[PDB]
Amino acid sequence: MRHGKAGRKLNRNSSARVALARAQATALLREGRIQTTLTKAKELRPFVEQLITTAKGGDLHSRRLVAQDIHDKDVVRKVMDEVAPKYAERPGGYTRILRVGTRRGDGVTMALIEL
Amino acid sequence: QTFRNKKQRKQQVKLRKPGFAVAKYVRMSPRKVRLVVDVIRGKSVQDAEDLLRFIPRSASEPVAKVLNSAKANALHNDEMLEDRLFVKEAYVDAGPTLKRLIPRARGSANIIKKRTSHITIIVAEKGNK
Amino acid sequence: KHPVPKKKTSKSKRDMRRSHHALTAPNLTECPQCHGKKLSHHICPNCGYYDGRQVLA
Amino acid sequence: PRAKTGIVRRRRHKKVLKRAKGFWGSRSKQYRNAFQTLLNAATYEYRDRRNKKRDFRRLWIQRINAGARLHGMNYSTFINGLKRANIDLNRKVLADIAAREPEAFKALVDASRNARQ
RNA sequence: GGUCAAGAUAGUAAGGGUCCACGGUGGAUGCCCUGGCGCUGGAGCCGAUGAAGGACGCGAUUACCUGCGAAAAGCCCCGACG
RNA sequence: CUCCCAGUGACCGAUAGCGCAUAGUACCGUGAGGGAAAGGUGAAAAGAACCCCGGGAGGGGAGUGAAAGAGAACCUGAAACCGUGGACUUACAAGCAGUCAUGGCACCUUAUGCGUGUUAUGGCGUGCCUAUUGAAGCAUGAGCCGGCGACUUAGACCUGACGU
RNA sequence: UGUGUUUAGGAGUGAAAAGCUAACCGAACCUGGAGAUAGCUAGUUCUCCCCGAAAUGUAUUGAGGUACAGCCUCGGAUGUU
RNA sequence: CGAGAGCUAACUUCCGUAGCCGAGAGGGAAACAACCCAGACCAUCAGCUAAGGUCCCUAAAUGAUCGCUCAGUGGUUAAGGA
RNA sequence: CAGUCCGCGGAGAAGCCAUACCGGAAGGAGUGGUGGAGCCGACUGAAGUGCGGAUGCCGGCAUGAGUAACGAUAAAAGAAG
Ligand SMILES: [Mg+2]
Ligand SMILES: [Mg+2]
Ligand SMILES: [Mg+2]
Ligand SMILES: [Mg+2]
Ligand SMILES: [Mg+2]
Ligand SMILES: [Mg+2]
Ligand SMILES: [Mg+2]
Ligand SMILES: [Mg+2]
Ligand SMILES: [Mg+2]
Ligand SMILES: [Mg+2]
Ligand SMILES: [Mg+2]
Ligand SMILES: [Mg+2]
Ligand SMILES: [Mg+2]
Ligand SMILES: [Mg+2]
Ligand SMILES: [Mg+2]
Ligand SMILES: [Mg+2]
Ligand SMILES: [Mg+2]
Ligand SMILES: [Mg+2]
Ligand SMILES: [Mg+2]
Ligand SMILES: [Mg+2]
Ligand SMILES: [Mg+2]
Ligand SMILES: [Mg+2]
Ligand SMILES: [Mg+2]
Ligand SMILES: [Mg+2]
Ligand SMILES: [Mg+2]
Ligand SMILES: [Mg+2]
Ligand SMILES: [Mg+2]
Ligand SMILES: [Mg+2]
Ligand SMILES: [Mg+2]
Ligand SMILES: [Mg+2]
Ligand SMILES: [Mg+2]
Ligand SMILES: [Mg+2]
Ligand SMILES: [Mg+2]
Ligand SMILES: [Mg+2]
Ligand SMILES: [Mg+2]
Ligand SMILES: [Mg+2]
Ligand SMILES: [Mg+2]
Ligand SMILES: [Mg+2]
Ligand SMILES: [Mg+2]
Ligand SMILES: [Mg+2]
Ligand SMILES: [Mg+2]
Ligand SMILES: [Mg+2]
Ligand SMILES: [Mg+2]
Ligand SMILES: [Mg+2]
Ligand SMILES: [Mg+2]
Ligand SMILES: [Mg+2]
Ligand SMILES: [Mg+2]
Ligand SMILES: [Mg+2]
Ligand SMILES: [Mg+2]
Ligand SMILES: [Mg+2]
Ligand SMILES: [Mg+2]
Ligand SMILES: [Mg+2]
Ligand SMILES: [Mg+2]
Ligand SMILES: [Mg+2]
Ligand SMILES: [Mg+2]
Ligand SMILES: [Mg+2]
Ligand SMILES: [Mg+2]
Ligand SMILES: [Mg+2]
Ligand SMILES: [Mg+2]
Ligand SMILES: [Mg+2]
Ligand SMILES: [Mg+2]
Ligand SMILES: [Mg+2]
Ligand SMILES: [Mg+2]
Ligand SMILES: [Mg+2]
Ligand SMILES: [Mg+2]
Ligand SMILES: [Mg+2]
Ligand SMILES: [Mg+2]
């Protein structure tokens, strides 16, 4: 049972759970919005919010702590110098989800995630 | 108010099928298709237009197109008023069946039924009542 | 091993089994900022407004 | 000359299926089981036609002793008193119809009881 | 008629059943024949001047069948039809 | 004798009839070899211009036609089997599915009745065949409907009944 | 281990299991004899009328099968046996 | 019923004999080929009975008279005791 | 199926479909509805002549059932067309 545990596998192992979180982070930071399945978007939101608050420190340590999860340099500069200083005033809550509705192939209910 | 024989009735009364549309040979299980076709049935043809559009089944596509043709020949051919139209009738019967061989373990085959579908819908004016 | 069903299942009991496969019609509701219908807690597919316009199309 | 079965068989079949039309399940629609259910149906038919007299005789007697005891006699004593006078030779069914007309039934009860004294 | 008591008693269908009506399926049934079977009776050998059976190929366009063969859906002489 | 030709038939007529209404093809086999389903617009193509919904496919109109209750998935179109609609019904019921009886509802084209459909309750009631001393059997066979499917022919024979 | 090649049906091959011989080898496969034989099993369909048994005796490479009696039926005669 | 074989076992096996069942429906024996009654041509919402029954289920005397058993014997044996 | 009669039929045959009628049964009629081109009745003759069964054959359609699975656990994600 999970009478307190937290998270989701997304039908994958540990390193896969991990790269998926890191790479959809990289994408919605690269592009400000992406559309993806509703589950995986609820997954992504706490990850990427933690990460933007990591980048809100300014420092070389904060940028290296982000560099570990986001290994395309240009996004690291965006999130660090462009986006986290933008959210300066925000006490947390740097993302939203609205749900675009259902896909045809697999009948998933996809949604949008933006900032 | 009736003719001599059926040979004359065939010539003078030509028998039309108002509100009627049918989509033959739809490559789909009927069993699946009736699942939505029940939802539509008896309802306002605009609610059919909307219901059919969010129910999340592959079978909703062909049952959509037919519904339009029903309303189409309800309006172009039959002089009916579209603010009356509604789904007086809807049903799907089974068409023919593609049979295919499928290999299975230890050298036996089986036969597999790709059922087709004859969807059919008949709209009519909500002038009843 | 290898359980099988015994007697062929009758039309009537089959239908009582399928008694629960009734589909649930979506609770549709019309977009305040447009014509058409939209699923609740989703954006209007036709217009794209969730409050301003949200999706592109 | 060939002479295929053809139209014969299906005439016979439809006759059976037409006898079997109240019946449940394939006792109504397949021939084989239709004909089979009709086998036991024939048995039960021929039984009941002469058992139904048993049941109705029961119902007559059962209704007669009711008025018998209603007056303070009973079936055994009451028919023994309607026999003890020779002149009563009506069937039990007519004693029932009289049990539906209380005045005449009581007249026969006093007649019978004036014959076992 | 209002409240309380005791008692009796409907209707509802998720889905079902019997019957009726309208279809879908499927290709039985009748009818037909473009195809067979048998008997009777005819006729009865081909081949080294190349058989039987084939393989390529021939057509404005030709995958299959026919017919035909680099003179190749064919060439010449006679007769018939018109 | 009959590869082949004609004629004929108390011969078949699409599961029949040759395996083939054509094909020794498809397909199966390394091979020798095995080996299928078969069909039907209509008189004539007049084989549906044009319009409508749909990428289609399919369909509705219009026309052609005697018939489109023939439209190329084109004669009829039975049964299983799948549905749509309407009558009567069904959620304290124990049940070889029926049988007779009584009541309730519906209906009236061999039909206002010694009625048809349905139904509630009461009584009654051990599928079928086979093989058996003995079958509801927990003995065999069988998913269901269709259709193929078994006491024949022969002979200068023997024997009996009947008839000429 | 490749290629090519030779050896086969009571025959081949076998460092021997009756193993292998084109995915069922104490005798392959195909075509045929051929509709082998089957005292063994199962199956044998339209209706009504009349009559109605046997599971006994003896014989048998016989005992779950046959022959002859015994019992059934149809007709003729006899004529109360 | 009469024997053998058996253990005076067997829904045992083998003979004699009668009846039923096989080939037999109908009432009784809760149920039940064999037991007890009784051999179904057909139809009736008619009558007398057989076996078996008459408190309710469940048709039909809570019948009558002299007792018997107070054990639920009735509704599962014996040697033996009281 | 055949011979011979009697006939019927595009104002419509067989076949198919309902049906409360009729004979003692196998069965057969009446009326209605499809169908669209052959066919009933009587007498006789010949048969490949009557199906529920054969783990029968050819065929179609059910039940299991919207069930098991979708063929290696080398994952996939965003944009844009
Ligand atoms: Mg998964
Ligand atoms: Mg923090
Ligand atoms: Mg006209
Ligand atoms: Mg087909
Ligand atoms: Mg197991
Ligand atoms: Mg009975
Ligand atoms: Mg109260
Ligand atoms: Mg039909
Ligand atoms: Mg011919
Ligand atoms: Mg040559
Ligand atoms: Mg050329
Ligand atoms: Mg030359
Ligand atoms: Mg000429
Ligand atoms: Mg053939
Ligand atoms: Mg056929
Ligand atoms: Mg052949
Ligand atoms: Mg080939
Ligand atoms: Mg089409
Ligand atoms: Mg048509
Ligand atoms: Mg037609
Ligand atoms: Mg066509
Ligand atoms: Mg024709
Ligand atoms: Mg047709
Ligand atoms: Mg109740
Ligand atoms: Mg129950
Ligand atoms: Mg019985
Ligand atoms: Mg035995
Ligand atoms: Mg059994
Ligand atoms: Mg079995
Ligand atoms: Mg001789
Ligand atoms: Mg003589
Ligand atoms: Mg050999
Ligand atoms: Mg040797
Ligand atoms: Mg081998
Ligand atoms: Mg021989
Ligand atoms: Mg013997
Ligand atoms: Mg003898
Ligand atoms: Mg004598
Ligand atoms: Mg002894
Ligand atoms: Mg014994
Ligand atoms: Mg014995
Ligand atoms: Mg016997
Ligand atoms: Mg007897
Ligand atoms: Mg008896
Ligand atoms: Mg007893
Ligand atoms: Mg009893
Ligand atoms: Mg018995
Ligand atoms: Mg018996
Ligand atoms: Mg016994
Ligand atoms: Mg006695
Ligand atoms: Mg009596
Ligand atoms: Mg007595
Ligand atoms: Mg009583
Ligand atoms: Mg004692
Ligand atoms: Mg007519
Ligand atoms: Mg008839
Ligand atoms: Mg014609
Ligand atoms: Mg004919
Ligand atoms: Mg035969
Ligand atoms: Mg049989
Ligand atoms: Mg069968
Ligand atoms: Mg089969
Ligand atoms: Mg499951
Ligand atoms: Mg699964
Ligand atoms: Mg697997
Ligand atoms: Mg991609
Ligand atoms: Mg982008």
PDB file of N, CA, C and O (backbone and C1' of nucleotides) and ligand atoms in Angstrom, chain F residues 42-43 66, chain I residues 10 12 36-37, ligand 57:
ATOM      1  P     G F  42     -33.085  -9.824 -63.190  1.00  0.00           P
ATOM      2  O5'   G F  42     -33.843  -8.970 -64.296  1.00  0.00           O
ATOM      3  C5'   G F  42     -34.127  -7.590 -64.078  1.00  0.00           C
ATOM      4  C4'   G F  42     -33.963  -6.783 -65.339  1.00  0.00           C
ATOM      5  C3'   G F  42     -34.325  -7.493 -66.618  1.00  0.00           C
ATOM      6  O3'   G F  42     -35.720  -7.648 -66.786  1.00  0.00           O
ATOM      7  C1'   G F  42     -32.341  -6.251 -66.938  1.00  0.00           C
ATOM      8  P     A F  43     -36.266  -8.736 -67.821  1.00  0.00           P
ATOM      9  O5'   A F  43     -35.173  -8.683 -68.984  1.00  0.00           O
ATOM     10  C5'   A F  43     -35.136  -9.633 -70.030  1.00  0.00           C
ATOM     11  C4'   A F  43     -35.444  -8.981 -71.355  1.00  0.00           C
ATOM     12  C3'   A F  43     -34.371  -8.061 -71.904  1.00  0.00           C
ATOM     13  O3'   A F  43     -33.462  -8.790 -72.699  1.00  0.00           O
ATOM     14  C1'   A F  43     -36.565  -7.107 -72.162  1.00  0.00           C
ATOM     15  P     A F  66     -40.752   0.861 -69.627  1.00  0.00           P
ATOM     16  O5'   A F  66     -41.204   1.013 -68.099  1.00  0.00           O
ATOM     17  C5'   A F  66     -42.535   1.347 -67.732  1.00  0.00           C
ATOM     18  C4'   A F  66     -43.199   0.227 -66.958  1.00  0.00           C
ATOM     19  C3'   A F  66     -42.700  -0.033 -65.542  1.00  0.00           C
ATOM     20  O3'   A F  66     -43.340   0.809 -64.603  1.00  0.00           O
ATOM     21  C1'   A F  66     -42.960  -2.080 -66.721  1.00  0.00           C
TER      22        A F  66
ATOM     23  P     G I  10     -52.840 -13.839 -65.429  1.00  0.00           P
ATOM     24  O5'   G I  10     -51.821 -12.663 -65.108  1.00  0.00           O
ATOM     25  C5'   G I  10     -50.933 -12.192 -66.117  1.00  0.00           C
ATOM     26  C4'   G I  10     -50.088 -11.050 -65.617  1.00  0.00           C
ATOM     27  C3'   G I  10     -49.948  -9.877 -66.567  1.00  0.00           C
ATOM     28  O3'   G I  10     -49.995  -8.655 -65.837  1.00  0.00           O
ATOM     29  C1'   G I  10     -47.787 -10.837 -66.113  1.00  0.00           C
ATOM     30  P     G I  12     -54.175 -11.481 -60.188  1.00  0.00           P
ATOM     31  O5'   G I  12     -52.932 -12.142 -60.912  1.00  0.00           O
ATOM     32  C5'   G I  12     -53.010 -13.468 -61.385  1.00  0.00           C
ATOM     33  C4'   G I  12     -51.633 -14.004 -61.626  1.00  0.00           C
ATOM     34  C3'   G I  12     -50.748 -14.151 -60.394  1.00  0.00           C
ATOM     35  O3'   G I  12     -50.995 -15.370 -59.700  1.00  0.00           O
ATOM     36  C1'   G I  12     -49.575 -12.998 -62.087  1.00  0.00           C
ATOM     37  P     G I  36     -38.872 -10.598 -57.934  1.00  0.00           P
ATOM     38  O5'   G I  36     -39.158 -10.850 -59.472  1.00  0.00           O
ATOM     39  C5'   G I  36     -38.673 -12.038 -60.089  1.00  0.00           C
ATOM     40  C4'   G I  36     -39.778 -12.826 -60.758  1.00  0.00           C
ATOM     41  C3'   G I  36     -40.133 -12.386 -62.172  1.00  0.00           C
ATOM     42  O3'   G I  36     -40.217 -13.511 -63.016  1.00  0.00           O
ATOM     43  C1'   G I  36     -42.085 -12.420 -60.801  1.00  0.00           C
ATOM     44  P     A I  37     -39.068 -13.707 -64.113  1.00  0.00           P
ATOM     45  O5'   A I  37     -39.308 -15.190 -64.657  1.00  0.00           O
ATOM     46  C5'   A I  37     -39.056 -16.317 -63.826  1.00  0.00           C
ATOM     47  C4'   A I  37     -39.987 -17.476 -64.105  1.00  0.00           C
ATOM     48  C3'   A I  37     -40.248 -17.786 -65.567  1.00  0.00           C
ATOM     49  O3'   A I  37     -40.439 -19.190 -65.678  1.00  0.00           O
ATOM     50  C1'   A I  37     -42.282 -17.405 -64.490  1.00  0.00           C
TER      51        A I  37
HETATM   52 MG    MG J  57     -40.297 -11.993 -66.928  1.00  0.00          MG
END
